[PDB]
Write a protein that binds this ligand. Structure first.
Ligand SMILES: CNC(=O)c1cnn(C)c1Cl
Length: 115
């Protein structure tokens, strides 16, 4: 509260660290469904069903241009990608499997880097 501060968690390296995690996810061999925005004109259902589309290249642009106020807003966009994937894809499909695999991969890097 007013004039009562908890001690300052050092966040000075967060941009660099998030950029590294994003780079590792971009180069993962199962990242191919997630590299570019889904084509809303060519994929039936996607525009109507998926209210907030998200992908790694959009996350990369937003990170490079100061559009993430903090750590957590970045992690929310990464998870949005995999949450969208689960909504639209069967668990037993290539894209669906890629999604579960990438989420697991991300969450471990996230824990090891920041927790
Ligand atoms: C991330 N992409 C998807 O979820 C998807 C599912 N089917 N198609 C054609 C696409 Cl593109």
């Amino acid at each position: 509260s007013m004039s009562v501060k908890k001690p300052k968690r050092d966040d000075s390296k967060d941009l660099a660290l998030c950029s590294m995690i994003l780079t590792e996810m971009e180069t993962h061999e199962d990242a191919w469904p997630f590299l570019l925005p889904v084509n809303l004109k060519l994929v039936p259902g996607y525009k109507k069903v998926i209210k907030k589309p998200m992908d790694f290249s959009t996350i990369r642009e937003k990170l490079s241009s100061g559009q993430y106020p903090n750590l957590e807003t970045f992690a929310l966009d990464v998870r949005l990608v995999f949450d969208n994937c689960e909504t639209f894809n069967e668990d037993d499909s290539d894209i669906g499997r890629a999604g579960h695999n990438m989420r697991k991969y991300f969450e471990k890097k996230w824990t090891d880097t920041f927790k």
